[PDB]
Swiss-Prot record:
Protein name stated in the entry: NSFL1 cofactor p47
Subcellular location(s) per record: Nucleus; Golgi apparatus, Golgi stack; Chromosome; Cytoplasm, Cytoskeleton, Microtubule organizing center, Centrosome
Subunit organization: Part of a ternary complex containing STX5A, NSFL1C and VCP. NSFL1C forms a homotrimer that binds to one end of a VCP homohexamer. The complex binds to membranes enriched in phosphatidylethanolamine-containing lipids and promotes Golgi membrane fusion. Interaction with VCIP135 leads to dissociation of the complex via ATP hydrolysis by VCP. Binds ubiquitin and mono-ubiquitinated proteins via its N-terminal UBA-like domain when bound to VCP.
First-to-last residue of the parent protein present: 171 to 270 of 370
Post-translational modification: Phosphorylated during mitosis. Phosphorylation inhibits interaction with Golgi membranes and is required for the fragmentation of the Golgi stacks during mitosis.
Domain SEP, first and last residues per copy: 11-76
Family to which this protein belongs: Belongs to the NSFL1C family.
Source organism of the structure: Homo sapiens
Keywords from the named record: Chromosome, Cytoplasm, Cytoskeleton, Golgi apparatus, Lipid-binding, Nucleus, Phosphoprotein
Length: 102
């Protein structure tokens, strides 16, 4: 976590995950496909334009948005791990009683 340094300009991916309620970005949490504030993301990402949260995540260079599908996984993005286990299956039990070291 950078906290307060700079947004490392190393050309990074902002993951957009598709859920049963909405979508989440690597910068934020799940926003349902209904809310008028999520509409910006939905509309811009629909086109291919960049929501501010992504450019406010990576430096203003290669901010690329990578899409994942999870859907009935509810929401798992900030929670822990990476990609929330999209490797052959989905979440796969999520047997992580802890946040770190797993």
């Amino acid at each position: 976590g950078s906290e307060k340094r700079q947004h490392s300009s190393q050309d990074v991916h902002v993951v957009l995950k598709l859920w049963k309620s909405g979508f989440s970005l690597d910068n934020g949490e799940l926003r349902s496909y209904q809310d008028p504030s999520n509409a910006q993301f939905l509309e811009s990402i629909r086109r291919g334009e960049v929501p501010a949260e992504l450019r406010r995540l990576a430096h203003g260079g290669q901010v690329n948005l990578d899409m994942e599908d999870h859907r009935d996984e509810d929401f798992v993005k900030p929670k822990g791990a990476f990609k929330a286990f999209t490797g052959e299956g989905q979440k796969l039990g999520s047997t992580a009683p802890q946040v770190l070291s797993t």
